[PDB]
C-alpha cells in the first residue's frame, strides 16, 4: 500500500512495453519480462513512470500492490544497473577458482566441487578467497548466492565456510 | 527446533509469523526456534 | 510529536538556560541528515546544541529576564550554549556565518542587555 | 494444605454445581481478583498450589486473600473392590465454586506484576477464569 | 575506556587491573613506575586512573581527582561504608573538610561552584548512608 501507491521512476535509456497484465522492459544490461496480478492494473503515466492501481482495498489487493510495485521496480532497475553479490571464504586450506564459465571450490572435501553458471548470470574472482556473482534477475542472483553459501555446513566454532560480503555469523568458543 | 503445541518468544526482538500451516517465532538465537505442533 | 515530548522539551530548554552562561539562536532549516555529525558530534562534548519548534521557545523564554527577545523569535530557532567558556562558542558561531553563508545571525543576550548583529560583533572579536 | 478442623457430617452427597454465584462476586479485600467462569470442584491441593505459586511470584511484599475454603468432602472407594458397600471414607476436600465468584485476591502494588502473578495462579487451576479490578 | 579506583600506595594489583587493561595490550612495567612516582607525593589518598585506550597501544594515564565515594571513607574515619542508606551512620564530617574535598575534586565533578561541588558529595553520602553536619 504505502509502497504501491508511489510511482516508479523509469530512467531515460529504458523501453517499457505494457500489454495488458504482461509487461516487458528493455535496457542496456538486457531485456526482462513480468506478469502483474489480475486485481491490479499497471499504467504508464504521461511522464513515462509506471503506476500500479488497485480497484478495492481488500487484503489480497493490499498485499499484492506493494509486491507488484517492488517487483516492477527491481525489474526496471536490473536492466539498467544489474545486481552483483560479492562473497568471501574463510578457513585455511579453502580455495575457489574460475574454470571457464563455472566455479571450482576446494573446501577440505576429499574432492573439489563444481558449480555450473546457469544462463543469465556470470561469475568473477578477485582473490583465491574472494569472488562475486553478477546478473540481471535478482531472484536468480539470490538463489545462486544462497546455494554457494550453503555449499558447506555452517561452522560457528571456527567460521570455516562461505560468507557474503558484509556477513556477520555467530561464533561459539571451544574451551578444549 | 522445539516442537510443542504452545510457543512464545524467549528472545527480546522476536516476531511471531504464520507459515504455510503452522506458526513460528524468529530470533537470532537458534535456541528460541519454535514451531506449533 | 507527543504532548509528553512538548512538555519535556520546554523543561529541558529551561534547564539549559538556567545552567548555561549564555545561549545563541540560529536558523538550521535547510540542512540534511549527514550534516548533524560535523554538527553535534564535535560540539556536545564541551558545548551543547538543541533544536525544537517555535511553540516551545515562547514558553521556555518566559522564565528569565529575556522578555525583550519576544520579537526576535521570527522563524525556526536552534539554540547553542557552552558549558565552560563562551568566547570560543562566540568565535565559532561568528566564523560559521562566513564559512557557510546560510546561518543568519540575529543577536543574543548579555547581562540583560539584548545585542544586535552589530553589537554582538563588537564582543565576538574580543 | 487447608482442611476443616472438624465437620458435623463425615460423608456428603456430591454438592451440586449449577446456577450462578450469588455471593462473593466482587472483590472486597484486595485490588486485583480472580473470578472463575466454569462451575467445577476445586481441591485443597490446587488451592495450595496456586497459593504457593503466588507467594513465589511475589517476594518480599504483597498480600493475598483466599475467599474459598475446602470444606466439602469427597470419598474414594477401595482400590479394586466390587460395587456395593458402605460409602468410602472422605479422601479429598473441595469447595463448590460457581461462575462469577472470586477465589483469590492480591494487594501487590505494581499492576503488571500482580497481573502476571494472577496469570501464573489461574494457570494452575482446573477451570477458566479472568482478572477483575476493584 | 574504563576508570577503576586503584589504591595509590599499592603497586601491581592483579585482581583489580590484572586483566582489566593488561588484556587490551598496554604494558604494566613502566606503568607501575609512573604510578609510584606520582603517588609517592600524596601517599595518603586513593587515585582513580581513567584508562584511555589508544591505537598504537600507547598509554597516558590521566591524573584525575580522587574519588568522592572513597574520600567519604576518609572523612568518616572508617574504610567500610554503611549497610543501608539513611538508616545508619558511621561518623560526622565537618563542613570545612567537605569544602576542601570539593576544592580538590573541582577538576572532576560537573559542578561549577563550591556549593554544587560539595552538594554532589553530599548526595553521594546520602545514597551511601552518611550525612554532613
Amino acid at each position: 500500500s504505502r509502497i504501491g501507491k508511489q510511482p516508479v521512476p523509469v530512467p531515460s535509456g529504458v523501453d517499457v512495453t505494457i500489454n495488458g497484465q504482461n509487461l516487458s522492459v528493455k535496457g542496456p544490461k538486457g531485456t526482462l519480462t513480468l506478469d502483474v496480478a489480475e486485481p491490479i492494473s499497471v499504467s504508464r503515466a504521461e511522464d513515462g513512470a509506471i503506476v500500479v492501481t488497485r480497484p478495492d482495498d481488500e487484503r489480497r489487493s493490499r498485499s499484492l500492490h506493494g509486491l507488484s510495485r517492488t517487483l516492477i521496480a527491481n525489474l526496471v532497475t536490473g536492466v539498467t544497473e544489474g545486481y552483483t553479490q560479492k562473497m568471501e571464504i574463510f578457513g585455511v586450506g579453502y580455495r575457489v577458482q574460475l574454470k571457464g564459465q563455472n566455479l571450482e571450490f576446494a573446501l577440505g572435501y576429499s574432492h573439489p566441487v563444481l558449480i555450473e553458471a546457469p544462463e543469465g548470470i556470470t561469475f568473477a574472482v578477485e582473490s583465491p578467497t574472494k569472488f562475486s556473482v553478477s546478473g540481471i534477475d535478482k531472484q536468480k542472483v539470490g538463489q545462486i548466492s544462497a546455494v554457494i553459501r550453503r555449499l558447506r555446513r555452517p561452522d560457528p566454532y571456527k567460521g570455516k565456510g562461505v560468507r557474503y560480503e558484509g556477513e556477520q555469523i555467530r561464533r561459539k568458543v571451544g574451551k578444549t | 527446533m522445539k516442537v510443542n503445541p504452545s510457543v512464545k518468544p524467549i528472545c527480546d526482538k522476536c516476531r511471531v509469523i504464520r507459515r504455510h500451516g503452522r506458526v513460528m517465532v524468529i530470533c537470532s538465537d537458534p535456541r528460541h526456534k519454535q514451531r506449533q505442533g | 510529536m507527543a504532548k509528553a515530548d512538548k512538555a519535556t522539551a520546554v523543561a529541558d530548554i529551561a534547564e539549559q538556560f538556567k545552567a548555561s552562561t549564555a545561549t545563541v539562536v540560529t536558523e538550521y532549516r535547510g540542512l540534511t541528515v549527514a550534516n548533524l555529525a560535523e554538527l553535534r558530534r564535535a560540539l556536545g562534548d564541551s558545548a551543547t546544541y538543541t533544536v525544537a519548534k517555535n511553540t516551545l521557545v515562547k514558553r521556555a523564554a518566559s522564565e528569565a529576564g529575556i522578555e525583550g527577545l519576544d520579537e526576535l523569535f521570527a522563524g525556526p530557532t536552534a539554540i547553542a550554549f557552552v558549558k565552560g567558556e563562551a568566547v570560543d562558542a562566540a568565535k565559532a558561531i561568528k566564523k560559521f556565518a562566513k564559512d557557510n553563508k546560510a546561518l543568519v545571525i540575529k543577536g543574543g543576550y548579555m547581562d540583560g542587555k539584548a545585542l544586535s548583529v552589530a553589537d554582538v560583533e563588537k564582543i565576538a572579536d574580543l | 494444605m487447608l482442611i476443616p478442623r472438624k465437620v458435623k457430617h463425615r460423608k456428603q452427597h456430591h454438592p451440586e454445581q449449577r446456577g450462578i454465584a450469588s455471593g462473593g462476586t466482587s472483590v472486597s479485600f484486595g485490588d486485583y481478583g480472580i473470578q472463575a467462569l466454569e462451575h467445577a470442584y476445586i481441591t485443597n491441593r490446587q488451592i495450595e498450589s496456586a497459593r504457593i505459586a503466588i507467594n513465589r511470584h511475589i517476594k518480599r511484599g504483597g498480600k493475598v486473600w483466599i475467599n474459598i475454603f475446602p470444606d466439602r468432602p469427597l470419598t474414594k472407594k477401595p482400590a479394586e473392590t466390587r460395587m456395593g458397600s458402605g460409602k468410602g471414607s472422605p479422601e479429598w476436600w473441595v469447595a463448590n465454586v460457581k461462575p462469577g465468584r472470586v477465589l483469590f485476591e492480591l494487594s501487590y502494588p505494581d499492576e503488571k506484576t500482580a497481573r502476571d502473578a494472577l496469570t501464573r495462579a489461574i494457570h494452575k487451576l482446573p477451570i477458566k477464569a479472568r482478572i477483575v479490578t476493584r | 575506556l574504563i576508570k577503576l579506583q586503584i589504591q595509590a600506595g599499592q603497586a601491581n594489583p592483579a585482581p583489580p587491573v590484572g586483566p582489566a587493561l593488561g588484556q587490551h595490550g598496554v604494558n604494566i612495567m613502566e606503568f607501575c613506575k609512573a604510578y609510584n612516582a606520582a603517588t609517592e607525593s600524596q601517599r595518603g589518598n586513593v587515585i582513580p586512573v581513567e584508562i584511555t585506550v589508544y591505537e598504537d597501544r600507547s598509554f597516558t594515564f590521566a591524573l584525575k581527582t580522587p574519588p568522592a565515594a572513597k574520600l567519604l571513607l576518609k572523612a568518616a574515619g572508617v574504610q567500610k561504608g554503611s549497610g543501608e542508606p539513611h538508616k545508619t551512620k558511621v561518623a560526622k564530617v565537618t563542613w570545612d573538610q567537605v569544602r576542601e574535598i570539593a576544592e580538590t575534586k573541582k577538576a572532576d565533578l560537573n559542578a561549577n561552584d563550591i556549593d554544587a561541588a560539595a552538594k554532589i558529595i553530599a548526595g553521594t553520602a546520602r545514597s551511601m548512608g552518611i550525612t554532613v553536619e
Binding site: - | - | - | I20, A21, S22, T25, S28, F29, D31, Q35, L37, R51, I52, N55, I58, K59, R60, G61, G62, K63, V64, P99, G100, S107, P109, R134 | -
Partner: protein, 188 residues
C-alpha cells in the same frame, strides 16, 4: 456538581419478558419511585447510561427528560451482573431539588507510605450525607511518612463543606502494616 441530561421513555410492558426484549436491543429499564410518589417505569439507553456512569457514575445525579417533563433523580444501586458487566436494571429517586440525602460514596487512597510498609483498603464505601448537587463523586485519603499500624478510620477523612459522615467514626478504612516477609507469606 453539574447534572447530566438524559432521555427516557415510559415503558409500555413490564416483566422479565419485556426486560429481556429491551436488553436485547441495547436498552435498560429503571424505576423512578422517588419519595412516596407514584412510581414510573422508564427505559434508558444502555450505551448512554454506561458512558455517564464511567464518566461520573457511582451514585451520580441525573436529569430525566420523560416526554418533555424534566426531573432530577439520583441513583441508588446498579446490580449489573454476577458474571458480565452490563446495566441490567437501575433504580432512581427524585432529589426534590436540593433536599439533603444520604448515600454511599467511593473512597480512594493517593499517597506513598514508608518503603517497608503495605497499605490495605478494608472498606471502599463511606456513608456521606449532602445535597443533591454537592454530593462528592469520590473521596481521597493520603498517606505519607506514616509508620506501621497507623489505622486510618473514616472519621479522619477530610470532607468538603456541607458534607457529613453518617457512619460511625471508628470504621477502619485503611490499614498500613509492615511489609510481610517471605515467612509471613508462606505461613498463611
Amino acid at each position: 456538581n453539574i447534572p447530566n441530561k438524559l432521555t427516557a421513555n415510559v415503558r409500555t410492558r413490564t416483566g422479565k419478558g419485556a426486560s429481556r426484549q429491551a436488553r436485547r436491543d441495547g436498552k435498560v429499564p429503571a424505576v423512578l419511585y422517588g419519595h412516596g410518589t407514584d412510581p414510573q417505569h422508564l427505559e434508558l439507553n444502555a450505551r448512554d447510561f454506561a458512558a455517564v456512569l464511567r464518566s461520573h457514575g457511582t451514585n451520580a445525579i441525573l436529569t430525566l427528560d420523560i416526554e418533555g417533563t424534566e426531573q432530577l433523580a439520583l441513583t441508588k444501586a446498579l446490580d449489573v451482573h454476577p458474571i458480565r458487566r452490563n446495566i441490567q436494571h437501575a433504580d432512581l429517586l427524585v432529589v426534590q431539588r436540593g433536599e439533603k440525602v444520604t448515600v454511599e460514596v467511593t473512597v480512594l487512597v493517593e499517597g506513598d507510605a514508608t518503603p517497608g510498609t503495605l497499605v490495605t483498603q478494608d472498606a471502599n464505601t463511606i456513608e456521606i450525607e449532602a445535597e443533591a448537587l454537592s454530593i462528592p463523586e469520590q473521596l481521597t485519603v493520603s498517606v505519607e511518612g506514616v509508620e506501621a499500624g497507623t489505622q486510618i478510620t473514616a472519621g479522619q477523612i477530610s470532607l468538603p463543606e456541607g458534607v457529613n459522615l453518617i457512619s460511625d467514626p471508628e470504621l477502619l478504612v485503611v490499614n498500613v502494616v509492615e511489609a510481610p516477609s517471605a515467612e509471613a507469606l508462606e505461613e498463611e
